A paper describes a structure:
Complex I is a 1 MDa multi-protein assembly that is central to [name] and cellular metabolism. It oxidizes the NADH produced by oxidation of carbohydrates and lipids to maintain the redox state of the [name] NAD+ pool, reduces ubiquinone-10 to drive the respiratory chain and oxygen consumption, and pumps protons out of the [name] matrix. This proton pumping contributes to the proton-motive force that drives ATP synthesis through oxidative phosphorylation. Here we define the inhibitory drug-target interaction(s) of a model biguanide with mammalian respiratory complex I by combining cryo-electron microscopy and enzyme kinetics.
Substantial evidence of disorder at the ND5 lateral helix / subunit NDUFB4 interface was observed in preliminary maps, so the dataset was subject to a separate local-first classification focusing on this region. The strategy yielded three major classes: one with a typical well-ordered ND5 lateral helix and NDUFB4, and two with distortion or disordering of ND5 residues 547-564 and nearby NDUFB4 residues 77-92. The Active-1092-ii and Deactive-1092-iv models match the well-ordered inhibitor-free active model in this region. Transmembrane subunit ND5 contains an unusual long helix that runs laterally alongside ND4 and ND2, which has been proposed to either stabilize the proton-pumping modules, or act as a transmissive element in proton pumping. Two π-bulges are stabilized by interactions between the lateral helix and nearby waters, and ionic and hydrogen bonding to ND4. Furthermore, in the classes from the lateral helix classification, density for IM1092 was observed in the Q-channel of deactive classes with both ordered and displaced lateral helix. IM1092 is observed in the ND2/NDUFB5/NDUFA11 pocket regardless of the occupancy of the Q-channel or the status of the lateral helix.
Residue numbers in the entry:
A (entry chain K): 1 to 98
B (entry chain a): 1 to 69
C (entry chain e): 1 to 95
D (entry chain Z): 49 to 144
E (entry chain H): 1 to 207, 215 to 318
F (entry chain J): 1 to 174
G (entry chain b): 1 to 83
H (entry chain A): 1 to 33, 45 to 115
Write the structure that this text describes.
Amino acid sequence: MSMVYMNIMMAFTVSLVGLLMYRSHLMSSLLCLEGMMLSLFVMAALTILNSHFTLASMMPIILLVFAACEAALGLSLLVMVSNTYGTDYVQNLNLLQC
Amino acid sequence: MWFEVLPGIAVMGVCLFIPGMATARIHRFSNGGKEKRVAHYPYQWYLMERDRRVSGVNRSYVSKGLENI
Amino acid sequence: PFFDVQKRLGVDLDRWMTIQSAEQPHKIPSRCHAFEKEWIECAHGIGSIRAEKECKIEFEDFRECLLRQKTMKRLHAIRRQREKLIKEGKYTPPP
Amino acid sequence: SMMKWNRERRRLQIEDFEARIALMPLLQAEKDRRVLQMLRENLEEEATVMKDVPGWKVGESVFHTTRWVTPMMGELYGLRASEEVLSATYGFIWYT
Amino acid sequence: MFMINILMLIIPILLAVAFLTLVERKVLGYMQLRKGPNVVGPYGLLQPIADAIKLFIKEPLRPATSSASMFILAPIMALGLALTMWIPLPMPYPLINMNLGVLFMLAMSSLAVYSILWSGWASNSKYALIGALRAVAQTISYEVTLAIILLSVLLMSGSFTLSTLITTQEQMWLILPAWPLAMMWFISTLAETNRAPFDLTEGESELYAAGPFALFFMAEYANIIMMNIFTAILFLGTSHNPHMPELYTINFTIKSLLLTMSFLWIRASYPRFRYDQLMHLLWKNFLPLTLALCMWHVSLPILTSGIPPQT
Amino acid sequence: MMLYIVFILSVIFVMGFVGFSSKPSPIYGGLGLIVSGGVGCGIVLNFGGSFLGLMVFLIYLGGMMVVFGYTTAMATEQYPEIWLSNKAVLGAFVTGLLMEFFMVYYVLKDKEVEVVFEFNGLGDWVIYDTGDSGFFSEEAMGIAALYSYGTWLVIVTGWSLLIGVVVIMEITRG
Amino acid sequence: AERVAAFLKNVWAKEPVLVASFAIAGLAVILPTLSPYTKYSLMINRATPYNYPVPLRDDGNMPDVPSHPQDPQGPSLEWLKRL
Amino acid sequence: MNLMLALLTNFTLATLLVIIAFWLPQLNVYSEKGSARLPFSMKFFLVAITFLLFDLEIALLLPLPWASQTANLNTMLTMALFLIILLAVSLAYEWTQKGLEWTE
Amino acid sequence: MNPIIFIIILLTIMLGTIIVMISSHWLLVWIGFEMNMLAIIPIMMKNHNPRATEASTKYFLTQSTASMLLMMAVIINLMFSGQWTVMKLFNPMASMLMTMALAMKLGMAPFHFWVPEVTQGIPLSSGLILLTWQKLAPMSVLYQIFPSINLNLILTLSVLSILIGGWGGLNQTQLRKIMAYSSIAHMGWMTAVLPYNPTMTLLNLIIYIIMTSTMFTMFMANSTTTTLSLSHTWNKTPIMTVLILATLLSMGGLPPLSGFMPKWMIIQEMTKNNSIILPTFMAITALLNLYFYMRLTYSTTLTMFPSTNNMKMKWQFPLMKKMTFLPTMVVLSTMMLPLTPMLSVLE
Ligand SMILES: CCCCCCCCCCCCCCCCCC(=O)OC[C@H](COP(=O)(O)OCCN)OC(=O)CCCCCCCCCCCCCCCCC
Ligand SMILES: CCCCCCCCCCCCO[C@@H]1O[C@H](CO)[C@@H](O[C@H]2O[C@H](CO)[C@@H](O)[C@H](O)[C@H]2O)[C@H](O)[C@H]1O
Ligand SMILES: CCCCCCCCCCCCO[C@@H]1O[C@H](CO)[C@@H](O[C@H]2O[C@H](CO)[C@@H](O)[C@H](O)[C@H]2O)[C@H](O)[C@H]1O
Ligand SMILES: CCCCCCCCCCCCO[C@@H]1O[C@H](CO)[C@@H](O[C@H]2O[C@H](CO)[C@@H](O)[C@H](O)[C@H]2O)[C@H](O)[C@H]1O
Ligand SMILES: CCCCCCCCCCCCO[C@@H]1O[C@H](CO)[C@@H](O[C@H]2O[C@H](CO)[C@@H](O)[C@H](O)[C@H]2O)[C@H](O)[C@H]1O
Ligand SMILES: CCCCCCCCCCCCO[C@@H]1O[C@H](CO)[C@@H](O[C@H]2O[C@H](CO)[C@@H](O)[C@H](O)[C@H]2O)[C@H](O)[C@H]1O
Ligand SMILES: N=C(N)NC(=N)NCCc1ccc(I)c(Cl)c1
Ligand SMILES: N=C(N)NC(=N)NCCc1ccc(I)c(Cl)c1
């Protein structure tokens, strides 16, 4: 494939590994989730623009809109977690262990 | 008196006047004395590129008329 | 679709954007319009098991238009040869 | 006032669009010859460059179909000075 | 030749900002029955120079910041973006002729809130961080109406190109068909630029220094001028004669000057909004009207048969 | 060369991703995403997507990323930790840059590389279209078609946004 | 009729901003259906020729298709010139 | 190329002014003289989140000037009003649920 | 939650699922999943406590990750075929990514860890939705893309799920965790037969939903969430203990009860394809499920556990919970085997 696709897919893989390899902050993991969205938006836009798929030109916008709404829900969960424990550390979310 | 506020306003006005005046005259200087060509759409760019080849000096703003027919 | 409600009601909810050879604003064609049209017409109605074999020619051409893998490989071949000759003085490009 | 002016502007756009339609046949004829000339020129250099490369047919299509296929940028400007390639690829996008 | 053009935009912008400080002080003075600067140079014409030099040779007292990179980033972002806002402005010819120029200005202006946020983080003080967040909330809130008002106007213009606003207003200023939007647009720019009666960053901290303070101030006043240049183009379109572009530049400058002076006029005339009150002015007053006028301006060209051309 | 602008931007794109994906302080991780967003817009711009490019700036960076930074300052980090101070972050950051540099170096030396899958390295311009002379933006035509063709898309998109408002008010009431 | 009139006077006195919003939004929804000019917006949009009008092969039985653009057959924009 | 040069000039100059503003002669020879819940209302979160959702709606209204050029005006006008009305319903919901209040 | 809002949120959970089921476009399928996940979170959060917040967060992270992977599969599919139609995918890497994403959405092993934890942390009514209605949309996509799924991948997921579900349930005293591990085991049967006969996937899904709804409804009727709390039912509602016994035996796949029918039919389809080891291994491994179902029957119906004195006060009040459709569902859950040939309606 084209050379640009090498790096866009690499960016998605890098953010996916970042997402699956948590540290402590929940916000850091939410940023990786947005990173995957941004790489998906670029890969979709490049494919659609280069192929001149005219009606598909709106699809990246719909992706952006829906994923931003997803991120707003994710942020709201983060603040509720932070209100409970005083931080957004994932290690605090282990009650359902038992 | 109030008109002693005008000198500061005049300096401000001349300062805001230069950007627009400079761009207009620079465009004429760089485009053969005409307005800079606007190409927002592929059709306009296509005609501008065709003008560059037709000019014979690789300048889209150098026009050729009936003398080339 | 799992439940083909669209076809039952004759209403087009998302079919309009499924393929690039469908109707587009101002009749703007996709780059691979003719290749997608050919493949779709070859494989229409015969099922995907049959189409995977009987329409392989149209699909390979359509895939070549989509990603141009064979074209880029050919261009890479000619360019690489040209560098060698430039590196050996047996070729001078024209004007 | 805005309605009257916008209707006039729509009439001015139709006149501008119809001038383009009058010229499109001439431009299309020119474009066809330029594309075919460029492809022909690349085919001569290919014959020279790939003369002593085994199993290389010169001008061989990569498609099974014999239909005419529009070339992509790399096919036309494959072997030309970067100044022209950059203008062809990114000139419009970059123009102001 | 193009680099000359860039400099001939940047330098006059910075000089106009400098002397707006003089003009603001003198206009405010005469509305307060006094004079304002009139000693440092004739009619105070050297006052901006003395202030600029003073600020830059002042001790740059920066407390040990929690982030060195974000302390430097905030002023660079603020000033860099402020100058960028000027490059698509047609006066009558833009430096950069963008097909989506209006959209470019909206997108760049939405980034200016990062300088507020980053400067809050770098302050290393929860009190200044809380002040930053209150300012960010005010700024994004009024971005909602600015975008919708702008969209409503463009439904009469037909495109996102800034120079097409000139064509749209060849016969008549857009303020006549759209004075309700011009009213809310104008107030929104005041709140956007944290200008009185929406200057709640200054008032609340009451109730940066030297060059770095000067840079944030320059960016603020560049934005103030640019907002009023935008308003003049959006609603008070000047006619352009292609053979005498300087007549456009004179008339359009006067309108922008007057609009900028009205910012100073308003600052002299009213008390300050409470924070919750300027939030209610947006969410409970401007936004309901802007939404209704947005619906109206979608329908109006269709129902009158006055849809503008795309090109 | 400017003939490799798209490739160069995509190299920076990846470096920004290795930046926040190594997960430093969420303040610096947010900066890495902002830089990646801007670089990503430039990549989309050079393929002819002016509107789509500006939406990333307007909505993704001026909208979502602003709210991310806003929320971070409130409920996560108020003062950044020194960047690359933690060994795990530095190891991850260095590893991603080392991988990226090798891809770039090898694809540039051979004008092609096989990192899992095989890519071409001649430059992205080679795949571009060679025949455009229409009096409009095709991307603009497609997006404008949301209101003629995409009635169903508008309904479900508008509904989801309204529900997002209702939902987030339920979540946060506590 | 009156209890509604007594309702409008109350909201006009208490919430003139909201009354204006709802009034404008109602006109935006209603007036397009009543306007006699709405039909012209459709025609003008269709009269704008964005792409080339590809000619038809003449098979000898198309008397309603002009042979020349200046012939009298085919759609006319005389209605638009007056508008 | 021009836009890149303009952007590079604007931020390069901004950078130069900032650094020189920090490093100027001083004429002195003597020694010079964390991630928790910030005490900030949930109301300010809801403003930012409310702005985001309205901003996403605005993204969908932006194509309207181009959409008005369609021959399918009946569909286009119905969908434009639907989207704006839904935006108004969103505001009405926050308003009547005391989401726009600053007391308490 | 305001009752009108609850209804609208529930209708949006259903609409998201329906959009997935009627869509012919991958983008609309993705939207359906996003809409569905948006509306489900509030009903997980509705009792406002740290356990519910942890459950909703773990759910959000799992589902949002899976939806990004699904979008990636769709886009790879677009690049290699230039179309969006919901059907077989045209790239093996796209097929794997979509299969893994749907496995994460279904909570199949080894992506199962979230199911027991999320189910434990939310109310019974919310857990009922999570383990029944929420399986419909991902299964309806597998139903359509199966011609291109990797056989080894899907059967590995099935085998792991049956093993993990059976073993995981052996160690549970919480009713919500038992149902969760039971769900993981049952998803394994549904997907094991998918490559061979998707109709049996639908049959197993439908019967699974009926039986699962019956159990949750009977747990809600008595407000029981633990094994010991359930063991007091005999002293309050003896009829309920019998209905639980029948439903548990049916869920254990014992003939002549309804739950035997899916296992019976799936074994038949697999053997017709000369798959003998896998069905036999599956059937024996499902005896682990039968074991911890039987344990519950012992402490609920077949013995009488100790009571408390305050239980007498409960004797003076009648059941007031809705128990909607419970009489119908319990009959279907147990007495349908004689109508097995009716499965052809699912063709
Ligand atoms: C038709 C073709 C399909 C064939 C498949 C097989 C169908 C059978 C499955 C049908 C579904 C189960 C329905 C069983 C109805 C149970 C009603 C009953 O038998 O009485 C319950 C009894 C009532 O007690 P009470 O509420 O107090 O009222 C009397 C006052 N003392 O409550 C009690 O007193 C408690 C009794 C103690 C517990 C004893 C349990 C052993 C008896 C089990 C009977 C149910 C069988 C379940 C397993 C299926 C068997 C094949
Ligand atoms: C929970 C809320 C559920 C609400 C469900 C509402 C369903 C609404 C269905 C909308 C689609 C109706 O049906 C579809 O509509 C559009 C516009 O009307 C039509 O589309 C029309 O506009 C564009 C113009 O090119 C094209 O799609 C097509 O050329 C034309 O026919 C479709 O031909 C028709 O099949
Ligand atoms: C805009 C271009 C203007 C070009 C002008 C070039 C002039 C260069 C000469 C600079 C003279 C600055 O003069 C000097 O400024 C610094 C500001 O930190 C002052 O302050 C400095 O000295 C005092 C003690 O004296 C220290 O406690 C202080 O920490 C230190 O910053 C000095 O008291 C003042 O003497
Ligand atoms: C003409 C149609 C034009 C299209 C309009 C576009 C859609 C806009 C939808 C806005 C719906 C708002 O609906 C609004 O709900 C609340 C219900 O609490 C009502 O307001 C009610 O509650 C408030 C408190 O908040 C009370 O003080 C008030 O006395 C009471 O009327 C409003 O009277 C009503 O207007
Ligand atoms: C919460 C849900 C909110 C949904 C809001 C939807 C409101 C829709 C209101 C406007 C709908 C009709 O708006 C307008 O009506 C007239 C009917 O006279 C239509 O008809 C008019 O235009 C058409 C062009 O297509 C002409 O052929 C016709 O002669 C003319 O009467 C218009 O095409 C339509 O633009
Ligand atoms: C879990 C990490 C997720 C990261 C995802 C990263 C993006 C993945 C990129 C997938 C795109 C490449 O996908 C891959 O392309 C090549 C050709 O291009 C295909 O083709 C390849 O295998 C088949 C084998 O018959 C042949 O075509 C040929 O031998 C070879 O080129 C592969 O069948 C396909 O799997
Ligand atoms: N608000 C006012 N107008 N007066 C005022 N305090 N001005 C600030 C003075 C100032 C700041 C930066 C620069 I550069 C310059 Cl030259 C002058
Ligand atoms: N996919 C499979 N392996 N099985 C399958 N569905 N075979 C199709 C054969 C069949 C069987 C029963 C009926 I009733 C009908 Cl109409 C058709």
